[PDB]
Structure 1
Amino acid sequence: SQIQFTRHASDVLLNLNRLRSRDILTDVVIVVSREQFRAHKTVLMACSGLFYSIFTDQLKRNLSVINLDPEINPEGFNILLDFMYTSRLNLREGNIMAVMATAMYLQMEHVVDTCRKFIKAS
């Protein structure tokens, strides 16, 4: 019976992306081959089965650096990190295979399914 604010979740994510853009309270650096990406672990956990499984473990929760599998494409990861913070996915014919593979690795099922839909329409 509570009052529903339709734009609050979107507004919160926009503010989290703004915080990431200014490196404010970022607590992890994700290393993908020769590239690095700072992020908030909470957002990563909220968006990825891989990161959720990592940081819910007390063994790994305080890690400040995570090195991804060497085969992961940095642009593919960048596209998915942007998606986590914006709800928008930059899928193109030139990046679909890399994004889909990276989404599988990050355990983002709805993204992978969407990639399968993009392939089906192309």
Structure 2
Amino acid sequence: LYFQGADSCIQFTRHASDVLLNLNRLRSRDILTDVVIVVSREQFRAHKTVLMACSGLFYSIFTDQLKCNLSVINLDPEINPEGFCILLDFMYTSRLNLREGNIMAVMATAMYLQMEHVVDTCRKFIKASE
């Protein structure tokens, strides 16, 4: 349940993962979602704070004084909606569903969103298949 942290303070082991699980439950039920991300013909509802916490691109967008208040954000029309959906799921769960058929689109999308460890992981998996 808990342990003594390096700073001699009590820390709860599953707290962060349980908070992320609850944030994903709010997303699934469309509770307190405050933005819609438009990717081509697709729309994805989400929480701006989670998007900012999980992306250099969203962090830059929502810290801009003009943009921070937009309810709709349109992504570059070159972005693959399935690649975005996989990454949005990863943001809210820590699980990255990489497959042979989606890895190029996921990698291109992670580069655009500035999710650097995800890009590096995609590169390693591609390199192993070559």
4+ aligned runs moved over 2 Å, structure 1: none
Query: Within 2, Cα distance between the matches of 1:33 and 1:45?
Result: 21
Q: Does 1:79 align with 2:98?
A: no
CA deviation after TM superposition for structure 1 residue 4, in Å: 1.1
CA deviation after TM superposition for structure 1 residue 64, in Å: 0.3
Q: TM-score, normalised by structure 1?
A: 0.99
Deviations 1:58-85 (A, max 9, x none): 1111110000000000000000000000
| Higher RCO structure, 1 or 2 (CA under 8 Å, sep 6+) | 1
CA deviation after TM superposition for structure 1 residue 49, in Å: 0.4
CA deviation after TM superposition for structure 1 residue 45, in Å: 0.1
Query: Within 2, Cα distance between the matches of 1:13 and 1:118?
Result: 26
Q: CA RMSD in A?
A: 0.5
Query: Within 2, Cα distance between the matches of 1:24 and 1:117?
Result: 37
CA deviation after TM superposition for structure 1 residue 115, in Å: 0.3
SS at match of 1:121: helix
Q: TM-score, normalised by structure 2?
A: 0.93
Mind listing any 5+ residue stretches in structure 1 that lack a counterpart?
Answer: none
Query: Within 1, Cα distance between the matches of 2:54 and 2:76?
Result: 18
Query: Within 1, Cα distance between the matches of 2:123 and 2:70?
Result: 33
Q: Does 1:66 align with 2:66?
A: no
Which of the pair has more CA radius of gyration?
Answer: 2
Query: Within 2, Cα distance between the matches of 1:8 and 1:118?
Result: 30
Query: Within 1, Cα distance between the matches of 2:66 and 2:10?
Result: 40
SS at match of 1:93: coil
Percent identity reads 98
Number of residue pairs matched by the alignment: 122
CA deviation after TM superposition for structure 1 residue 23, in Å: 0.3
